[PDB]
């Protein structure tokens, strides 16, 4: 109930995301395509994007029969 308020002032929400892609593909150093994708398919979490981009070859094994 009683909704916050949501938009404030001019937000740089693409801007922001432009300037990440690029920048998770400088510290990287994969294609610019990537980012987008990796940053989209994670939920644009550049830490953890990274962090898993990073370390690709060796996921949390472990799973769990139910």
């Known amino acids: 109930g009683s909704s916050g308020s949501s938009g404030m002032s001019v937000n740089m ?11 998770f593909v400088l510290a990287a150093g994969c294609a610019a395509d990537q980012a987008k994708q990796l940053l989209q398919a994670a939920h644009w979490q550049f830490e953890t994007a990274l962090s898993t981009f990073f370390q690709e070859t060796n996921i949390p094994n472990s799973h769990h029969h139910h």
């Open 13 to 23: 929400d693409e801007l922001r995301h432009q300037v990440m892609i690029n920048q």
